Amino acid sequence: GPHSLRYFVTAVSRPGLGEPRYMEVGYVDDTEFVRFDSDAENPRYEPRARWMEQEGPEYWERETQKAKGNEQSFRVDLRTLLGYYNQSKGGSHTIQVISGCEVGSDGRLLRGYQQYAYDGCDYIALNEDLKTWTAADMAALITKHKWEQAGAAEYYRAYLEGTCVEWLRRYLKNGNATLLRTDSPKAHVTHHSRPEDKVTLRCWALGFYPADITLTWQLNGEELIQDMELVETRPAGDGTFQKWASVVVPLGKEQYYTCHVYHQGLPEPLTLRW
């Protein structure tokens, strides 16, 4: 199947408390594998997955130097934006960036992207063509004009088609035992009483990988996606994921409702009831 390499970057100013906090977190698919945090006492890029023990000391030195350079560029960006938006230097502001590439089962590039936000709002983003940028407001238009004269998109496109894809392939090879594995979900149903002769039925799916999964509740062969409540799929602390979905039904009729679980690790979907 397809795989992705993504880097989430965040810069947060804190007037009166020193330099901005800067963080970088990298993921291969939905597994955290590297991290940089300016608030550690010896900021260094560090491994977050066991298989990264396969990289040599030079890899860590290079990533650390890049992170320190990035930290300085975003510090400048925070000041620049105060100017574009005519804001004071007394408040805290945030810049966020998501960069990544995705390849197919054969390892060839499917798509690439880079999007920026300021104070939680779209700022500027690379178009699908990997050649031009699209700006959300007049401040980002100034940035767009600067980047067009500097050839920023061409440099990023080179990273996507070369570096990004080549290293993603390497990580999938080195960490194959972890990244290409499949852990099957184990499910169960809990029961809770409520006011007005009704009951809450909650379907749980535990210990699975990859994260993509589908949980549904059915009544007479029909899905109840509407009156159903749920939580976003979440990490469970050991590299696996979990999720739950519930529905409210009449007391004494619980046996007519069934939970269905679909996942890569389930040759045949699971069907269960209270």
Partner: peptide
């Protein structure tokens, strides 16, 4: 391998 040079805004 992380992006190397984020252009200034």
């Amino acid at each position: 391998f992380a992006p190397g040079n984020y252009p200034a805004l």
